[PDB]
Design an enzyme around this catalytic site. Structure first.
Site, short mmCIF file in Angstrom:
data_model
loop_
_atom_site.label_atom_id
_atom_site.label_comp_id
_atom_site.label_asym_id
_atom_site.label_seq_id
_atom_site.Cartn_x
_atom_site.Cartn_y
_atom_site.Cartn_z
N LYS A 127 -1.11 8.03 -2.08
CA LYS A 127 -1.51 6.85 -1.33
C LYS A 127 -3.04 6.68 -1.23
CE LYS A 127 2.05 6.02 1.35
NZ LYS A 127 2.70 6.15 2.65
N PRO A 170 0.76 -1.22 0.00
CA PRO A 170 0.00 0.00 0.00
C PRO A 170 0.80 1.29 0.00
CG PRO A 170 -0.79 -1.51 1.62
CD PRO A 170 0.48 -2.07 1.17
N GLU A 171 1.87 1.36 -0.77
CA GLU A 171 2.49 2.65 -1.07
C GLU A 171 1.97 3.08 -2.40
OE1 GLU A 171 6.59 2.76 0.13
OE2 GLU A 171 6.09 1.19 1.64
#
Length: 271
Positions: A53, A1-2
């Site tokens: 993000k 999740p970057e």
DNA sequence: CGTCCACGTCTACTAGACCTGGACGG
């Protein structure tokens, strides 16, 4: 999740749903404290975009869809484990907390927002988070200017490794990218942020914040989210040069997040 | 059985909290 995985995810949604037509309600798992999505339409299409993000879904009713419904946008943040999968309707993974159901002509699928630790969030309304800076992938020059126009910000009093996590200037950079970024220039993670940035008022640190995450998008796959077995996981691991690698040092930044690096920790190192 | 660790905010007063599960230790 970057940022890379957000980006990959929106592009997976666009591709996998290109030819799908969804229908019905949008369903939330019961365990989730995120809001219910009040959205119903007999025939709608789903699309996505990423910024930093975050990722936005747009749910778009086709002409004549019932009941009446204007498009709806939802913005997602992934936390530490969020992701999207498209799966057979009766073979829902867990922990699929938000689900969108395909409509009849075709095998019944579900687009799922899947998030084990549940740090993910979604918001009704399609707005980026106020306060987040521009996307290091898609808004590079805006990103670069906002950093440089704002060096007096107290954010930059901090170690460069910490300032890299600050999503007001580095929207999309996370723990792995910062190690990778700094590693490419041998910048000690605990140099003062302002000192490393003041140089700018061969690629420099701000260019790597774009070009490093871009590299991960170009590997394609799921980036950090990719599962061992892993055709794409082995790729990502093979791309990583510093984060978690043998040979490297690691230290905790002031918020308990591990930073990996080689060599000098830098002047501000917790000591 | 356990303890530690993980791709990130979020919010009540720079720590905890919020979560599940994998790896490894005994």
């Amino acid at each position: 999740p970057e940022g890379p995985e957000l980006h990959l995810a929106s592009q997976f949604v666009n591709e996998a749903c290109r030819a799908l037509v969804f229908g019905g309600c949008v369903e939330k798992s019961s365990v989730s404290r995120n809001p219910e999505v009040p959205f119903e339409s007999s025939a709608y299409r789903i699309s996505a975009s990423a910024r930093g993000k975050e990722l936005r879904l747009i749910l778009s009713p086709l002409p004549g869809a019932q009941p009446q419904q204007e498009p709806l946008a939802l913005v997602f943040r992934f936390g530490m484990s969020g992701s999207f999968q498209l799966v057979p309707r009766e073979e829902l993974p867990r922990h699929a907390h938000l689900r969108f159901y395909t409509a009849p002509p075709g095998p019944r699928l579900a687009l799922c927002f899947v998030d084990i630790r549940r740090f993910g969030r979604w918001d009704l309304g399609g707005k980026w988070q106020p306060g987040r800076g521009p996307c290091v992938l898609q808004e590079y020059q805006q990103f670069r200017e906002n950093v440089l126009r704002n060096l007096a910000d107290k954010a930059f009093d901090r170690p460069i490794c910490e300032a890299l996590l600050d999503q007001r200037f580095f929207n999309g950079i996370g723990n792995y990218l910062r190690a990778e970024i700094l590693y490419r220039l041998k910048i000690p993670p605990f140099e003062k942020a302002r000192s490393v940035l003041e140089a700018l008022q061969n690629p420099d640190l701000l260019e790597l914040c774009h070009s490093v995450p871009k590299e991960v998008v170009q590997l394609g796959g799921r980036g950090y989210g990719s599962e061992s077995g892993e055709e794409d996981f082995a790729a990502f691991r093979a791309w990583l040069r510093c984060y978690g690698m043998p040979g490297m040092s690691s230290l905790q930044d002031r918020h308990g997040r591990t930073i990996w690096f080689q060599g000098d920790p830098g002047p501000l190192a917790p000591k």
